Amino acid sequence: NKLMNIIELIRKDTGINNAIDAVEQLALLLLVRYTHEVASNEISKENHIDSFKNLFFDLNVIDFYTLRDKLNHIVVNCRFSFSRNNWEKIENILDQIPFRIRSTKILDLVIHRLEELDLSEGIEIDFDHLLLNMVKDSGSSGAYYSPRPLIKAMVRVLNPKPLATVYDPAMGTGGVFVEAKKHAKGGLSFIGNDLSPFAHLIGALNLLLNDIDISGVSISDSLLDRDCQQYDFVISGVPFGKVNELTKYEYYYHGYSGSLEAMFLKHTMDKLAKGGRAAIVIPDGILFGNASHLDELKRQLLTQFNLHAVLSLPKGTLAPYSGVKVSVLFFDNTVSEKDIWFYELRTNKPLSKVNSITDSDFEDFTSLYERREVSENSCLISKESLLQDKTLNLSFSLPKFDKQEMIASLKSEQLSLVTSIENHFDYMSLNLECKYIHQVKLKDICKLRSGDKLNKSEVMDSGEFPVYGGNGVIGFNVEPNRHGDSIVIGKVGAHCGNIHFSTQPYWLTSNAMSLELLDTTKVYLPYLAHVLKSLELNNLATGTAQKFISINKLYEVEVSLPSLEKQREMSEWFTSIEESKSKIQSLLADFSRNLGTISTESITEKALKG
Amino acid sequence: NKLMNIIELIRKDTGINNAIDAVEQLALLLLVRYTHEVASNEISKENHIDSFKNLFFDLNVIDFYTLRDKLNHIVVNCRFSFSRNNWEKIENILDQIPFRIRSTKILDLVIHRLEELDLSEGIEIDFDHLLLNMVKDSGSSGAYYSPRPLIKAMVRVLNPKPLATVYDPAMGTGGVFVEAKKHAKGGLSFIGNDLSPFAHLIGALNLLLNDIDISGVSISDSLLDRDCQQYDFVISGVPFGKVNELTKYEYYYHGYSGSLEAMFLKHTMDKLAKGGRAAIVIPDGILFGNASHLDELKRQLLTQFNLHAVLSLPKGTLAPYSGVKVSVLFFDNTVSEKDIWFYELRTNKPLSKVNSITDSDFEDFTSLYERREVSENSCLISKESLLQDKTLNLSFSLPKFDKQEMIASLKSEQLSLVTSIENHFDYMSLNLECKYIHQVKLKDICKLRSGDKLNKSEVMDSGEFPVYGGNGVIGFNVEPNRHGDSIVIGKVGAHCGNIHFSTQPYWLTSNAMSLELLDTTKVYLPYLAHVLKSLELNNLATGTAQKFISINKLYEVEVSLPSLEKQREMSEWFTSIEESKSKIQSLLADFSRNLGTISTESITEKALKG
Amino acid sequence: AMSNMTYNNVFDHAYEMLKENIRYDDIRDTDDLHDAIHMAADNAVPHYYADIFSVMASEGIDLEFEDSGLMPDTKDVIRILQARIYEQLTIDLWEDAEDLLNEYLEEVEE
Amino acid sequence: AMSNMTYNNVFDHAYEMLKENIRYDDIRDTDDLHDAIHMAADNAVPHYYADIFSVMASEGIDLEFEDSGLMPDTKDVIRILQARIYEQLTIDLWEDAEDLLNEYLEEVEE
Numbered sequence A, B: 001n002k003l004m005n006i007i008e009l010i011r012k013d014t015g016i017n018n019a020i021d022a023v024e025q026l027a028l029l030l031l032v033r034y035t036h037e038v039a040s041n042e043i044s045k046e047n048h049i050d051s052f053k054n055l056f057f058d059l060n061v062i063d064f065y066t067l068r069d070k071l072n073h074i075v076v077n078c079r080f081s082f083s084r085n086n087w088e089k090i091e092n093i094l095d096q097i098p099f100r101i102r103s104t105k106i107l108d109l110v111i112h113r114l115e116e117l118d119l120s121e122g123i124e125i126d127f128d129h130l131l132l133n134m135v136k137d138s139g140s141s142g143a144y145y146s147p148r149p150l151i152k153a154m155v156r157v158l159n160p161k162p163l164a165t166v167y168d169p170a171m172g173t174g175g176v177f178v179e180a181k182k183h184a185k186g187g188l189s190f191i192g193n194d195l196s197p198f199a200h201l202i203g204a205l206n207l208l209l210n211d212i213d214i215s216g217v218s219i220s221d222s223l224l225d226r227d228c229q230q231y232d233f234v235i236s237g238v239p240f241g242k243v244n245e246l247t248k249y250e251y252y253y254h255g256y257s258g259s260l261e262a263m264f265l266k267h268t269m270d271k272l273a274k275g276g277r278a279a280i281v282i283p284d285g286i287l288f289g290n291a292s293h294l295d296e297l298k299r300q301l302l303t304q305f306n307l308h309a310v311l312s313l314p315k316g317t318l319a320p321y322s323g324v325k326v327s328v329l330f331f332d333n334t335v336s337e338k339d340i341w342f343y344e345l346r347t348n349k350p351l352s353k354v355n356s357i358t359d360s361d362f363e364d365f366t367s368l369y370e371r372r373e374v375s376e377n378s379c380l381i382s383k384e385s386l387l388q389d390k391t392l393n394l395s396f397s398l399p400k401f402d403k404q405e406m407i408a409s410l411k412s413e414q415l416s417l418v419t420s421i422e423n424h425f426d427y428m429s430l431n432l433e434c435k436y437i438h439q440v441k442l443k444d445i446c447k448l449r450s451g452d453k454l455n456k457s458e459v460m461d462s463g464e465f466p467v468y469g470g471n472g473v474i475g476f477n478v479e480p481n482r483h484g485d486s487i488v489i490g491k492v493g494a495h496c497g498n499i500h501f502s503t504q505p506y507w508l509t510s511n512a513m514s515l516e517l518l519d520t521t522k523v524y525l526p527y528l529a530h531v532l533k534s535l536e537l538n539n540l541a542t543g544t545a546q547k548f549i550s551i552n553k554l555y556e557v558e559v560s561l562p563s564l565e566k567q568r569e570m571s572e573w574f575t576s577i578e579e580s581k582s583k584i585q586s587l588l589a590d591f592s593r594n595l596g597t598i599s600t601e602s603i604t605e606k607a608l609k610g
Numbered sequence C, D: 001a002m003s004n005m006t007y008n009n010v011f012d013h014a015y016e017m018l019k020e021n022i023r024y025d026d027i028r029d030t031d032d033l034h035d036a037i038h039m040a041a042d043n044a045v046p047h048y049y050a051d052i053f054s055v056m057a058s059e060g061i062d063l064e065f066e067d068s069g070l071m072p073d074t075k076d077v078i079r080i081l082q083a084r085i086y087e088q089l090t091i092d093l094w095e096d097a098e099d100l101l102n103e104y105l106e107e108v109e110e
């Protein structure tokens, strides 16, 4: 609020990069004032040893160079028993971050605005309002900044023990340490690092304003290990991959394509101590299955560290800086023997541009973090299941119907309904002429002998060898009774007289009788099978409680047959019309019940809302 | 044979009617010679009293008039102890039948041919050959002549007892008496009558040649009774009806339209003695049912006389004279308490023109005359059955199927198959929008109370009052339980939860529960019936051996309903699509099995000859 | 033989359960007996093939249903018979149940 | 109770008919026994509802068919059971019949 007027005061001389140069200059002046205003009460007090105040900026006109020398002089008098011991860190930022204001009129107004600020519980909550108002106005400023509601929820589910050392590979603005201190308000050995000098200035300044030690904060390359050691907690919002100048610079990180979110994932795994929990925000593009070079990373991560929870964050949570979809892993080292919890966050409206993510949307995730089974927006997935798949994909989804497409497919069934019956109609009207050469009897043409009764020794579901009973094919015994591939007829069943033709050897049950022709020069077995089927042999049977056909009564059956040339022509006509009858009636039965379910469920569609 | 040469001799002087005038002249000369040749051996012998021979025709030139006087003179000498006592009959024929030959050359040749004929077992079988050859050549000559094979079969089935008096109302050529004498060869008091003089000449001459007494033969009108008496046997082949001059002549025969075959039927009934059998050949045109004036005749004939047999004779048995279909009745007087036997005669080819009826075709009818049950061509019919009908029809017939017309009607079923399902398809796609005003519960909208159990006191097939059970409508008790015309639901059955809507009062069984709405301002019962049907109430039921719905569990069922204006609009849409579902599936089931029987019986058509 | 269980053995098992069900659950409403008699009948029905036939062979039951709609419309005779014995139990309990409930309430009369 | 008829009562009725059928009709051909055992089995099957269940409740039979094709494919349990007892009679007679015919012919051996 007050800091926004300072940004508006910084105007013409830079006058090109109002977005970040103004924030960079403010943080440069604000940090210089912090050291000066802290040094005033540290050893100066009043009159015992007096210190010139706010005279370095306008020393001699403007001389920002002379300010650096007088600032050192103030600290020299202070060193007579943070900030002061590691003064090299604060002195280095002055080297890296240069002053750019060259107007006395403009500089005169900002420095007088600076002394008005009260650093006792005031500048803190006006600096984050400035930081938040900067990334929405500049977009690119969101590279070093992550949503505070995200950080607040991440550090809450972490629950850092007082005896812990929180570490951030990319400390950025230091928002994680601010939330970690706020979470444990009612200390932690904070460690940080960063590459861009502006974020190092913003991060170090913001940690000082919240009265957090900046002894662990530094400026270096996190991907380049040099020599480092693990830490108890590792929480970060890692960036996105690029190799503009770093194409050949990260040689020892072999396998990676220069992906920051992937290389930092390897960094956080190396820098996570035994028993230490972690939470890293990563984009969804690097947890997919097609990431071949990253499949090794996910494989070792899922094998060693206990990745037990992933949160789906809507696209794009990460501000106007990027619209990508992100997610936060929760691998806590230790043992990986636990299934992965999954929460899917949903908001009232798409975010990023305006009305961004809030801490109210994370309320459900915080409460249900350790309760695995939660309804609607969360679930549990198995570890070994996705590890056993071809590619390791970490983009999880929730595991949790009458339409007008049914009539569309039901119309297709009607298309096939008439397709075959019209073909069946006109194929029945051929009336191929034929004359019978013989008029023989079943007595003197074939051999009718029934088989014996099997004691249900074998009745396999499948087999290369069949068995025929009173009706149909039941059983698959390995021993044949009738080696001939002939015709069998039911005898003792209620469906006796059924004509079944066998193309292969089989065994004959006592409930049926085998027909084997005496002379192959007279009859074609399939023609005889149809003409025996046409005679309706069930009338021949007699009995009260059961129907039975006698072997003698079958011998006395007369059958008229034509020539072999015609028998095969008629059998092929007889068999084709029969197959169409069985198929068309079968499709009619399927079509009959399918129209019933389509008509009922369509009625229930408009009578029930659910 | 010999007589044909005489016919060929009679030539020029008549020379216009070779058909019958030649036969008339021959029979006139043949009869004159018969009396002369019979009188020669009767009293003349030789020399004791001598008689001039064959001198009357050429007495003085030709004088046929003088022949009549000399013929009388011969008989005068004979009368010194048939033909001679009743000489008036033979003398009358000379008056009625005139001589027409006027050529001496022609008359000289025929009379010398006449004396060559030997009357001892010779002229008989040459006269019928002449008679038979006349009707085939003249056609109209068949009016006085009937087929000899017909007469031979008729008289055989009559079996006249020796103590009998055979009578013919139309003696014609006398063929019945000739066959009656031949049938009883290994006497009968024959009586006859006729109107046409030519047939009286032919009939009297032919009876004399077969040595049959002509004392009962006369010339008169049979329809005019004058005064007559019954006879033991009445067999005739009656003629066909006409009233050219007889329009007003047969006044006392009231009711008839002048039908000879009908009036003679009345004559034969009046002239049949008690216990006397008869057989009359009549055309089929007068035994039909539309013969209104003849229905009285058939009614009294079937009521009094024992008409027990009718023979179907093919059209047209009665020669080239007429192609009409004829039949012979067999009414034997006595008592009419016997069913009517019927024989249907069939020949190898149509007759009449050439290859006419034979006595071989009657062989089956003669043997099976008294055996009622005979296969193929004969049957037995009931008397009271046709007497009870509206019109009495005596044209009996024999009381004794897969085609390509089935597919023609099966194609019509397919026409109706698509007719309704396409209408059912597009009527299901309406999607009429609706919004539910209320979302109530079954607890606070209706009253659910089940009925008591009835002890199966009444379960009538039909009735004005119904009873509802666990599923469907079973029973028709006269006492109502629930006067309201509301909704009932099954409770205890395996088909429980079935929704049946009642439009009228009924009694409620213990297997179901009644739903009656509390406020009629909220729900339309048919809409609730469909929405209760849509909820599938069978899931609500619990049980092991049987499924049961609790009354409390039905109260807890939630149902969303719209406005009354919409409920009726939706119920009418819901009910119509439901009716089409039941009807289309029902026609599918009929069409499914009908195609199966059409396909099978068409297969058996070409595999079996019978 | 095989099973000594009869219908009247099954009925007494179902009748005494109704004596227990009526007294413990009050069920003063006569329409609560329907849910009550069903629990005694459903639990008394046997499920073994020897018990079903032995009950079916004993006196007190037929294969004839009083209600045709209660027929399961299936080809399994076991299901048809256990639905059959149940159907008789409900109508046999019915006549005795109403009286059983009538004389049960000795608390509002003397 | 009701009916004292059991399966082994029915079987002895069918077995002794086969002893009578075999001896009177010679039937030396083993395929004539099929027509012979059927006549003894078909005639021994009961037709009353009390006799069928009492036989079904006794020992020696189940509701399980050896051949599924012999099932009548109907909803009447009476027809299914009388076809069931018949099916057992044919296979129970079968093992004893061949031996019965083997030792019957004492006229061609000693």
Ligand SMILES: Nc1ncnc2c1ncn2[C@@H]1O[C@H](CSCC[C@H](N)C(=O)O)[C@@H](O)[C@H]1O
Residues within 6 Å of the ligand: A143, A144, A145, A146, A168, A169, A170, A171, A172, A173, A174, A175, A176, A193, A194, A195, A196, A199, A220, A221, A222, A223, A236, A237, A238, A239
């Ligand atoms: N090689 C490198 N080493 C360390 N940090 C790097 C880097 N490359 C980029 N980064 C940093 O990644 C950070 C963006 S993330 C900023 C989020 C910050 N941790 C917070 O709490 O808000 C920036 O600081 C960027 O400079």
Ligand SMILES: Nc1ncnc2c1ncn2[C@@H]1O[C@H](CSCC[C@H](N)C(=O)O)[C@@H](O)[C@H]1O
Residues within 6 Å of the ligand: B143, B144, B145, B146, B168, B169, B170, B171, B172, B173, B174, B175, B176, B193, B194, B195, B196, B199, B220, B221, B222, B223, B236, B237, B238, B239
């Ligand atoms: N009023 C009438 N009275 C008697 N006979 C008549 C008649 N009108 C016609 N007819 C006769 O009916 C006869 C034809 S039927 C001749 C069949 C003859 N009975 C036979 O045995 O062959 C003719 O004689 C004809 O003259």
